[PDB]
Amino acid sequence: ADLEDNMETLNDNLKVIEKADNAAQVKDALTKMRAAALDAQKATPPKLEDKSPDSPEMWHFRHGFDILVGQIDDALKLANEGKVKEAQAAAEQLKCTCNHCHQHYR
Amino acid sequence: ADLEDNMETLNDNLKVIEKADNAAQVKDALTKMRAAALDAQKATPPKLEDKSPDSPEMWHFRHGFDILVGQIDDALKLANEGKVKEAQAAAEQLKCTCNHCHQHYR
Ligand code: HEC
Ligand code: HEC
Ligand SMILES: [Zn+2]
Ligand SMILES: [Zn+2]
Ligand SMILES: [Zn+2]
Ligand SMILES: [Zn+2]
Ligand SMILES: [Zn+2]
């Protein structure tokens, strides 16, 4: 999928987690976010003029998704333990990772 | 100053901005935050075992302070224009930069 689709997958599933009732719903949404993050990691920021994979800012761009995936994995551990409220709170901590990349690249 | 002092300078002055009344108070606090950020940029994260300046994660650590300084400079432009409420809102956007580095390194 393209970057827009991957970001809206992240966006919609974060909301699903917030409104979820049980561990299975949270797990399903986090699983979809993880795949969307790794897919988006292959894209480039539109406003970044230098697209070279070896450039510092492309390393930083991909690094940001590795951090996001790590946080998603933290939340998945809680969801797999059945800790719904805890997993929802962990998903809340994602938001500053989203907002940070956005401010930096958009 | 050491890392602890620099972080509490950032911490206390962010609160000063939130409670400020005029552009001069906001400007003074942002100016102190900027210096504290550049000083902290010379430190290393305690829990990072590899301290080599050329390592990717030390590049990332220093990069995070350059981003923070850029955001402080955005807020300073508004404060120097007398736009108090706008500068306070810009200081609010700093928080995800703080929280992101913290989650990543602490
Ligand atoms: C964390 C969970 C999130 C969430 C919820 C979103 N993102 Fe991102 N994002 C990144 C870039 C470069 C863009 C610009 C895309 C473009 O200009 O084409 C975006 C954009 C978005 C949107 C807006 C989509 C739109 O309609 O324009 C949304 C809703 C969104 N994102 C959600 C880059 C990154 C990251 C790189 C390291 C990370 C992490 C995130 N985004 C994280 C998130
Ligand atoms: C943005 C405006 C902020 C604010 C308000 C704070 N920081 Fe940081 N910070 C960083 C690291 C590596 C640490 C660990 C320090 C240690 O373990 O010795 C901290 C710690 C803090 C604290 C806690 C101080 C304490 O009493 O333990 C506080 C209050 C704090 N910070 C405020 C690293 C970074 C960054 C690197 C890129 C950035 C940016 C920030 N911090 C940003 C902020
Ligand atoms: Zn969209
Ligand atoms: Zn960068
Ligand atoms: Zn302290
Ligand atoms: Zn890093
Ligand atoms: Zn970063």
Swiss-Prot record, chains A, B:
Names of required cofactors: heme b
Cofactor: binding comment: Binds 1 heme b (iron(II)-protoporphyrin IX) group per molecule.
Function description: Electron-transport protein of unknown function.
Domain of life, per lineage: Bacteria
Biased composition (Basic and acidic residues): 47-60
Keyword annotations: Electron transport, Heme, Iron, Metal-binding, Periplasm, Signal, Transport
Gene this protein is translated from: cybC
Residues that coordinate or bind heme b: M7, H102
Family named by the database record: Belongs to the cytochrome b562 family.
Protein location: Periplasm
Keyword Signal: yes
GO biological process, one term: electron transport chain
Subunit field text: Monomer.
Name under which the protein is recorded: Soluble cytochrome b562
Chain segments carrying region Disordered: 38-60
One of the record's GO cellular component terms: periplasmic space
Molecular-function annotations in GO: electron transfer activity; heme binding; iron ion binding
